Amino acid sequence: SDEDMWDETELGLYKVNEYVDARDTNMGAWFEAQVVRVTRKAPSRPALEEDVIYHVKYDDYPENGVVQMNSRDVRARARTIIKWQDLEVGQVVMLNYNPDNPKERGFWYDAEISRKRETRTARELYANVVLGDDSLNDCRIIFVDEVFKIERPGE
Numbered sequence: 001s002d003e004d005m006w007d008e009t010e011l012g013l014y015k016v017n018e019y020v021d022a023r024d025t026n027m028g029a030w031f032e033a034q035v036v037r038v039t040r041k042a043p044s045r046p047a048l049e050e051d052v053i054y055h056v057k058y059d060d061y062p063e064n065g066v067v068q069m070n071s072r073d074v075r076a077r078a079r080t081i082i083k084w085q086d087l088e089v090g091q092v093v094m095l096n097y098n099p100d101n102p103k104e105r106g107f108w109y110d111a112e113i114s115r116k117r118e119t120r121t122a123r124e125l126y127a128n129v130v131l132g133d134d135s136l137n138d139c140r141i142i143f144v145d146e147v148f149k150i151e152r153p154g155e
């Protein structure tokens with residue numbers, strides 16, 4: 001076996017210099033980052049995206065250094081907002097939530113829209129917010145005009 005051996009690659013799904021979102025595995029949120037190097041472990045195998053290690057710098061956390069990511073924790077940078085009128089229960093989107101202080105600005109989490117209400121006085125959005133392998137149901141989402149479409153690589 002050769003999990004310890006790696007080489008650079010230019011044939012990862014994401015490329016050096018690409019602006020991406022990268023997911024912190026300790027707290028489950030996505031952050032703006034840039035890919036600075038792409039390596040691939042196990043040179044004995046045919047090239048697999050599962051073997052790619054992305055080396056990223058988080059835009060707002062330079063003190064974290066060059067962080068290594070599994071391919072599942074990198075995706076193209078979110079760029080398109082799904083406006084209020086287009087949001088629907090069941091959509092999985094990236095949105096801003098603060099689990100510790102839910103009235104405040106927080107971090108960017110993936111979330112499944114769970115309830116959408118329009119009353120005479122407010123637009124109310126609720127979502128099941130993903131943290132790692134688990135989710136918090138029915139979080140009230142403050143930032144209803146900044147919900148992002150997730151860029152999926154496809155298959």
Ligand SMILES: Cc1cc(C)c(N)cn1
Pocket residue numbers: 021030031032077078079108148
């Ligand atoms: C984590 C993240 C946040 C924003 C606002 C955008 N546009 C992309 N990624």
